[PDB]
Amino acid sequence: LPPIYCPLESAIHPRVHEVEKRAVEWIRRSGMCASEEERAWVIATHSADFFARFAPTAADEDRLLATSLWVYWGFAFDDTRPAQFNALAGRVQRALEAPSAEDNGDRFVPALQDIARRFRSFGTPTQVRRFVHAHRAWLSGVAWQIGNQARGHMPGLDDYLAMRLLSAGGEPTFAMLEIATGAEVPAQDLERPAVRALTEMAIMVAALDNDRHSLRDQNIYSVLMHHRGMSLQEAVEEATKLRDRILLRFLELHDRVRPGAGAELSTYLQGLRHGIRGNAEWGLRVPPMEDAPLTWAESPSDSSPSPLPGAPSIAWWWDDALL
Amino acid sequence: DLPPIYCPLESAIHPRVHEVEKRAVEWIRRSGMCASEEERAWVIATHSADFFARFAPTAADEDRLLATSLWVYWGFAFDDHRCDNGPLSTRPAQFNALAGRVQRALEAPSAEDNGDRFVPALQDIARRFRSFGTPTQVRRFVHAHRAWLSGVAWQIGNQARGHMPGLDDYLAMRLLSAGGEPTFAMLEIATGAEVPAQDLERPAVRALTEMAIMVAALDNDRHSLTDQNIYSVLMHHRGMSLQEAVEEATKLRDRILLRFLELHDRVRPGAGAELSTYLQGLRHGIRGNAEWGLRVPEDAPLTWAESPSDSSPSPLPGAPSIAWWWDDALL
């Protein structure tokens, strides 16, 4: 219902149409897709359009292609019992780390291994490891979510935000910014608690915007309705206040970190901001992407600068002493 | 009929092992980690300070060796009560949530235990790592720790199904579930030695780390002898006797150790100071793992093999997912 607060820069790679056409060929040829139907469903994610918003000035079209390919892959892979999923997640992650691993007729492994090959031809081994760790974090997230669903466990707010941080694919998505842009962010700059908090907050805002984008299971609305006793409308309102509050804290902490930041950390931070907006805008415009004018909230629904009560796993985002 | 371990590597133990052991035993009593005197005594009997004092035997700061040894105690305890025998040990759906909560607590100091006695203990370990290590070094441990839990989740998935993995899946799984990734990721935190990312993430050094982890995991399978281990894996997939399996396992573990040694000798000369200390750690830990395994209930002369049981310098047959360790062009 309520329009999205997102006062962040919107931009899209000028070569997005050229990257999309190469991506559509890669998808047709990959083996990822059994039937013509499934090729069309993956194409209809408009994943080039999504990631071209994340890295809108990427110098090398081929690096933007490679990173865009993983987004298609993630959507195809996400479209299994916990016991078999823990093994699949293990085998798929091994294939990302081990170029010698063999497919064993799993349709998703050669495809992932083709993306990994392209990442290893552009990226420093350091940037590839950052992606690998991000990819395992996402898989852990998915495993947690598949486990909760199989058991009929509706998690509380704390567990739900912890899990969604990972299961919504934001860690591997933001971990591709560097691979798309080129220059390596120094470990000292990327692993700073303040920058880790910016990354997780960008991820969390993108995940809650994706919860919103699918209202029409385990999402913020069911979690709040089950564990607080809310109507749907009361939960939509609470979810928005909560998300808007994480985003204010992101803007606050970004304005403290940005001034001192080196070239590469500065680029990465512009990426978080582009990605938050890009994800929101992509989710508004996706069914030929819709191009009718969009309305954006001028103001946050909740302007508190305090931690979310009921979500202690994210409270540390507000603890400047810790950062 | 189980043959001696081939391990021609430096055996060394920290001169202050007994002082660190004593502080570790005090911490284990205060930790709330152990439900009963019986479980305190079981954790103490892992001699985890003896174990990790062999991995960083010249660690300048005893507080760094202590913090590091604590996680080894914690891991043994967590694994015994939550991974290997807990109602979670065949309940993958529940383990996935626990893995998520425990891993979040390691990453987020603000996180709350929600009744899990393992969580406050790990958070104190993490607090020590954050006080000593760079945020980069702590991120390496955190990533390693998640890798380990992913492997345990795969193993518990297998158990629930009664699925006995083949060699390839078993090696890949056990690379993670034996806890070698977080164990070796604490080397740097014990020595103080921040290893530049360009040096640690080199494919060649990643291969050396994985091989050290793989040899120590196969040595643990040997120390611990339906159960998922290399002997059941070969018995099930190759229709071997236990005796033929024991000999097959020794062959393929020795052949991995020989590749570790060949690659180490090509990597070591070029290495800077911090990577050099890290590689000495891989070697000390392989040996430390094997010797701690043979001595843990102590001082009687050990016998080691003089020769590897197999010395093919080619990838292990039936294990494609590790064949890249022998690819010098990738490495």
Numbering used by the authors:
A (entry chain B): 10 to 88, 98 to 234, 243 to 313, 324 to 359
B (entry chain A): 9 to 233, 242 to 313, 326 to 359
The publication says:
In particular, we noticed a surface patch of five consecutive ancestral mutations (205DREMH209) in the turn directly preceding helix H. This patch is located 17.9 Å away from the carbonyl atom of the effector residue (Ala186), so that it unlikely impacts the activity of SvS-A2. Moreover position 89 in the catalytic DDxx(x)D motif occupies a His in SvS-WT, but an Ala on the surface of SvS-A2. Exchanging these six residues on the surface back to the corresponding wild-type residues (205–209:DREMH/AQDLE and Ala89His) resulted in a surface variant of SvS-A2 with similar stability, despite an overall reduced expression yield. Therefore, we anticipated that the surface variant may constitute a more suitable structural template for homology modeling of SvS-WT, especially with respect to adequately capturing substrate binding. Using the surface variant as a template (monomeric with modeled loops, metal cluster and GGPP) resulted in a homology model (SvS-WT-Hom2) with overall higher sequence identity as well as optimal average scores for dihedral angles (Z-score of +0.541). Specifically, the local Z-score slightly improved for the catalytic DDxx(x)D and NSE motifs (arrows), even though the local Z-score for the RY-dimer decreased. Overall, we considered the homology model derived from the SvS-A2 surface variant (SvS-WT-Hom2) more suitable for mechanistic analysis of the extant enzyme. Redesigning the surface of the ancestral enzyme to restore wild-type sequence at selected positions provided a crystal structure representing an optimized template and improved the confidence in the derived homology model of the extant enzyme, in particular for regions involved in substrate and cofactor binding.
Spiroviolene synthase (SvS) from Streptomyces violens was first described by Rabe et al. and represents a bacterial class I diterpene cyclase that we were not able to produce in sufficient quantities for crystallization due to protein instability. Terpene cyclases such as SvS form a variety of complex multicyclic compounds with potent biological activities via carbocationic, electrophilic cyclization cascades of relatively simple substrates, either by metal-ion assisted release of an allylic pyrophosphate (class I mechanism) or by protonation of an oxirane/ene-functionality (class II mechanism). We previously reported a hypothetical ancestor of SvS—SvS-A2 26—which shares 77% sequence identity with the extant enzyme.
